[PDB]
Write an enzyme that holds these catalytic residues in place. Sequence first.
Site, PDB file in Angstrom:
ATOM      1  N   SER A 154      -4.401  -6.501  -7.629  1.00 39.26           N
ATOM      2  CA  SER A 154      -4.174  -6.442  -6.180  1.00 39.26           C
ATOM      3  C   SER A 154      -4.639  -7.767  -5.536  1.00 39.26           C
ATOM      4  CB  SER A 154      -4.743  -5.170  -5.675  1.00 39.26           C
ATOM      5  OG  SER A 154      -4.321  -4.953  -4.315  1.00 39.26           O
ATOM      6  N   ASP A 246       4.797   1.159  -5.127  1.00 39.33           N
ATOM      7  CA  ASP A 246       3.800   0.314  -4.496  1.00 39.33           C
ATOM      8  C   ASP A 246       4.526  -0.492  -3.425  1.00 39.33           C
ATOM      9  OD1 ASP A 246       1.903  -1.735  -3.886  1.00 39.33           O
ATOM     10  OD2 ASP A 246       1.529  -2.212  -6.011  1.00 39.33           O
ATOM     11  N   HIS A 276       0.135   1.900  -6.587  1.00 35.74           N
ATOM     12  CA  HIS A 276      -0.865   0.854  -6.481  1.00 35.74           C
ATOM     13  C   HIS A 276      -2.240   1.431  -6.767  1.00 35.74           C
ATOM     14  CE1 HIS A 276      -1.890  -3.150  -4.960  1.00 35.74           C
ATOM     15  NE2 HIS A 276      -3.032  -2.654  -4.621  1.00 35.74           N
TER      16      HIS A 276
HETATM   17  N1  ABN Z   1      -6.358  -2.731  -4.402  1.00 38.43           N
HETATM   18  C1  ABN Z   1      -7.473  -1.868  -4.008  1.00 38.43           C
HETATM   19  C2  ABN Z   1      -6.947  -0.686  -3.253  1.00 38.43           C
HETATM   20  C3  ABN Z   1      -6.413   0.380  -3.957  1.00 38.43           C
HETATM   21  C4  ABN Z   1      -5.903   1.471  -3.274  1.00 38.43           C
HETATM   22  C5  ABN Z   1      -5.918   1.497  -1.898  1.00 38.43           C
HETATM   23  C6  ABN Z   1      -6.445   0.440  -1.196  1.00 38.43           C
HETATM   24  C7  ABN Z   1      -6.950  -0.657  -1.871  1.00 38.43           C
HETATM   25  N1  ABN Z   2      -4.886  -6.621  -1.563  1.00 36.24           N
HETATM   26  C1  ABN Z   2      -4.381  -5.415  -0.891  1.00 36.24           C
HETATM   27  C2  ABN Z   2      -3.550  -5.896   0.266  1.00 36.24           C
HETATM   28  C3  ABN Z   2      -2.235  -6.307   0.124  1.00 36.24           C
HETATM   29  C4  ABN Z   2      -1.501  -6.766   1.195  1.00 36.24           C
HETATM   30  C5  ABN Z   2      -2.090  -6.833   2.439  1.00 36.24           C
HETATM   31  C6  ABN Z   2      -3.394  -6.477   2.568  1.00 36.24           C
HETATM   32  C7  ABN Z   2      -4.136  -6.003   1.507  1.00 36.24           C
END
Ligand code: ABN
Ligand code: ABN
Lengths: 309, 309
Positions: A154, A246, A276
Amino acid sequence: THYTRPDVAAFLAFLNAQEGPKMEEMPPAGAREMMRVMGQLADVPRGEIAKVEDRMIPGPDGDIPIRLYDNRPDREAGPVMVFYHGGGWVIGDLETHDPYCAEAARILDMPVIAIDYRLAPEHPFPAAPIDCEAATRWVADNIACTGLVLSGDSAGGNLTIVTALALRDEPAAKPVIAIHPIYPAVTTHNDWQSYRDFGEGHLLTEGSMTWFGNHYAADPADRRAAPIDFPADGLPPTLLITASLDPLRDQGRAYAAKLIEAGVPTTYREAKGTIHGYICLAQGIPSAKDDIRGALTVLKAIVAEATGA
Amino acid sequence: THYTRPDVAAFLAFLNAQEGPKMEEMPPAGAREMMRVMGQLADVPRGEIAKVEDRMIPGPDGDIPIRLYDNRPDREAGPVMVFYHGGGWVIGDLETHDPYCAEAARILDMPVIAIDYRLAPEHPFPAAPIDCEAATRWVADNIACTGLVLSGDSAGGNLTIVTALALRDEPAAKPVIAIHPIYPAVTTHNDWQSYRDFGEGHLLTEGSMTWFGNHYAADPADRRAAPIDFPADGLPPTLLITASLDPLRDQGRAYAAKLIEAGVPTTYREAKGTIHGYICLAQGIPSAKDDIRGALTVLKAIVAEATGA
Ligand SMILES: NCc1ccccc1
Ligand SMILES: NCc1ccccc1
Ligand SMILES: NCc1ccccc1
Ligand SMILES: NCc1ccccc1
Ligand SMILES: NCc1ccccc1
Ligand SMILES: NCc1ccccc1
Ligand SMILES: NCc1ccccc1
Ligand SMILES: NCc1ccccc1
Ligand SMILES: NCc1ccccc1
Ligand SMILES: NCc1ccccc1
Ligand SMILES: NCc1ccccc1
Ligand SMILES: NCc1ccccc1
């Protein structure tokens, strides 16, 4: 409507029935606690592993905590993985991703070094990229290794790609031999069909993405935020995995396509019918264990081909 | 300059010094003989293999010759590879690609069935795609197997993709598990930087490509000629390889990018510093042995993941 694995749908229904505030309604400290608790409930344990060690290393804006995982500490020098956790640049830590890192060490049979990089909003952009690049260079200088394998999920997938670009332009003491961004963010823009389709009801929501992004305060024109807007030529062999439900799926596809158009050897995987965040949900979503093992088996082979050449 | 392996440059210098007419100055029968002689001189031998058998099967226009290669003939039913040779839809046969097919059988540990499809100009487009589809359906109906792996080089890489699209739309008696197009053509047009860069002096030349195209007389609007212009959603897991000094490189990159943008699991490899046609040049260009082995090792793993799920 959209293909969803039965175990994923079961987990989403369990999520939906929980009471209490959304992450976006919490101060950072509460959100951080929420993610820790979620991992305790919905992730697998660390399990058995030979060696886990913590230390502090020097960094440009202060010391950086790092954690080494190794299931075979009498190894000869070989590849080492450097891992950047996810959490929207605000949450996550060495504990939230501990089960995955130990599993990665076991499957890959390489040391895994997880970086506890500075978090927003206390340390907004570009603190996370600065820490991740400095820690990665430190590993290259100070750890017996032949080359680096960068990975993260992520926000950590973003940091993987950003750090690989940094080291491409200005090599560390050891080459980056492969990278493994997991459901990465590669741009700040949301003009994607997957965002329209999956921005509600699939854990990473429009609401949470806004909340993270407001705290991080990234510069959308900087390569350290939006690497898709900058040349990918000369990056290492890449394993990029997305989740099919996702919001970030389509930008991950786009980045993998960009790598191939630049001649970078690229393996693209898509975890079909999952969401995700799955790499830390392996108890709540049992199928995640197969997504994890599948990807890491392919990464181990990429790294073996590099070290055999 | 462009990165060229020393052994590749050695082989090109040898090619350049050869006297006698260019392929495109020859009738088809002479061109066919030229390719057979080139394989005798510049490819490895068949080598040891347990079983190689020839038979005719009933095709739409008459008998289609096929050749079965198997290094473990007492096997239980499993995947089978169906292979379509290259040769610009005009040349090539069961002998030109025999060393590669035997090596594929050995490394993959599956049977390989090579198809001797109708060639132009005696049988112009769309004879080759028709035969390849008919023979593939025959294999699914008549050979003990659990699924099909389609593969082929150059024109045969085109036929791999076109055949996989036809079977996606109307399944054979066994599913296509995976495909492996090798330096494929995926469009009739030449507006690619790689064509401008490598269209002379790298074996597959502008002249040869015009000669092949004129004989084959493909319809540029038909999916069986130009698969890049038609949806790729729902194709099987794909391993696509290009050569970095190939005029067709960029269209191969583009097709792999298209697959990923459609959510097809895709492994992209680029044989860096070598040319179009390497899979039949493993004695003249010894590094081709590594390109061959490296791709087939990856393909073996793709098939194992499919059949294990
Ligand atoms: N990438 C961390 C995350 C997972 C699930 C929901 C929000 C943020
Ligand atoms: N890293 C999670 C996320 C993705 C896109 C925008 C904000 C946060
Ligand atoms: N042996 C170096 C080290 C120790 C702990 C954590 C990371 C790296
Ligand atoms: N909108 C948050 C963000 C920041 C950096 C990169 C991607 C997304
Ligand atoms: N030792 C391989 C080689 C041959 C010629 C030129 C460079 C390298
Ligand atoms: N002929 C092998 C070789 C190439 C370059 C330099 C030294 C030796
Ligand atoms: N020994 C003649 C030769 C060597 C390498 C490649 C072509 C020809
Ligand atoms: N007569 C057995 C056989 C099967 C397939 C291809 C050739 C020969
Ligand atoms: N399929 C292109 C080609 C032409 C002549 C010799 C080998 C390969
Ligand atoms: N221009 C020759 C050709 C025919 C069919 C497909 C690709 C290229
Ligand atoms: N299959 C060799 C080739 C490619 C493009 C155009 C003509 C022939
Ligand atoms: N690698 C030496 C060589 C060159 C041409 C043909 C066969 C072998």
